[PDB]
Homo-oligomer: A and B are copies of this chain.
């Protein structure tokens, strides 16, 4: 029986072919772990919002030219799909107080369709509020996150920009190799009028915030160049990310 009942040895064994995640899902969870080992805990919320959550709380305030350039999806007059994931942190800053931070992943919507802009793309808005942090402690964390998401291949340059809910502002804009510089993320310290209509005193407190695009980060990381291919969901494209 011993030298007779032998089998074939290298035939493929029986199993079910396991399948992998989505690339923006993997990048969201990777940056979630990267910030979870600093103590940031996530926060979530709804995708539909009135004006007092999305525009009039971030000190826009309504006659500003930020209500057509955001390319919003309106419903009647006090309903819109969420244009930037910040109501999830305003509804957290309002309730409790005042020395803890949070991050938030989620879906935003912008009325733009081309071969370079899907109408939906995931954003990741951080938030941190505690005593005596500044722009030095913004560069020293975003530089660290870029050096850890990449593997120290690329160079950064902090340049100025303008977002209405954070002033003084910035932009981080890592070094590519095909062109000159690709703009990756933007940041800035929280405006005091954002703090004052929430319940935090801006005379003693401070903080910053940052918002990055997950699909441009994932495209630049894993080499993909066609942004519309992320959401047509072909298995022959999605199987290599496993």
- Per assembly, the copies of the chain total 2
In the assembled complex, which residues on chain B have CB atoms less than 8 Å from the CB atom of A38? 39
A193 to chain B, nearest CB (A): 33
Is the interface on chain A under 10, 10 to 19, 20 to 34, or 35 or more residues? under 10
A188 to chain B, nearest CB (A): 26
Q: Mark A55-74, 1 if CB is under 8 A from B, else 0.
A: 00000000000000000000
Among A23-40, those with CB < 8 Å from B are 36-39
Main secondary structure of the interface of A (DSSP, over half): loop
Q: How far is the CA of A37 from the CA of B33 in the complex (A)?
A: 9
In the assembled complex, which residues on chain B have CB atoms less than 8 Å from the CB atom of A37? 36-37, 39
Closest B residue, CB atoms, query A41: B37
A107 to chain B, nearest CB (A): 26
Among A1-53, those with CB < 8 Å from B are 36-39
Q: How far is the CA of A195 from the CA of B39 in the complex (A)?
A: 29
